Amino acid sequence: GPLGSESLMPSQVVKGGAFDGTMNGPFGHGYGEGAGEGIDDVEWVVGKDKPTYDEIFYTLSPVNGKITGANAKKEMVKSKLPNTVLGKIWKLADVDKDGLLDDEEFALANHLIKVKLEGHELPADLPPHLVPPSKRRHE
Numbered sequence: 001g002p003l004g005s006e007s008l009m010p011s012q013v014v015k016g017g018a019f020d021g022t023m024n025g026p027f028g029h030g031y032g033e034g035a036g037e038g039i040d041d042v043e044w045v046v047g048k049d050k051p052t053y054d055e056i057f058y059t060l061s062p063v064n065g066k067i068t069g070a071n072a073k074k075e076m077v078k079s080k081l082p083n084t085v086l087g088k089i090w091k092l093a094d095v096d097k098d099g100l101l102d103d104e105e106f107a108l109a110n111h112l113i114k115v116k117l118e119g120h121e122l123p124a125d126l127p128p129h130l131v132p133p134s135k136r137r138h139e
């Protein structure tokens with residue numbers, strides 16, 4: 001034991017003038033966690049970058065308020081991808097899978113394009129905080 005040999009504590013701490021009487025046996029720990037409930041805040045990150053995708057939208061020349069998927073495919077093709085990433089970008093951006101993309105569907109299309117550009121591919125998941133207004137629905 002501690003007689004005939006000095007029993008040193010694993011961490012040698014010096015409590016100068018502090019006679020410590022830690023009552024052992026109770027165990028617990030809880031900090032003030034910031035609880036975020038469903039406050040009425042519905043704003044997908046595209047509402048603030050749509051102007052970019054929408055300007056390119058009219059820049060590629062849309063028809064009847066949406067781009068023919070042809071030009072949308074051009075856009076995501078020049079985004080420098082194989083048909084693998086490209087195909088799943090299309091099917092992850094176009095919720096209806098029309099063969100076209102409206103101003104918001106380009107918004108998503110190009111948004112996921114810059115998401116893959118972040119250095120990570122798309123996970124084939126479509127979150128309710130990234131679904132264009134027309135498709136605000138979890139089914």
Ligand SMILES: [Ca+2]
Nearest residue numbers: 094096097098
């Ligand atoms: Ca669509």
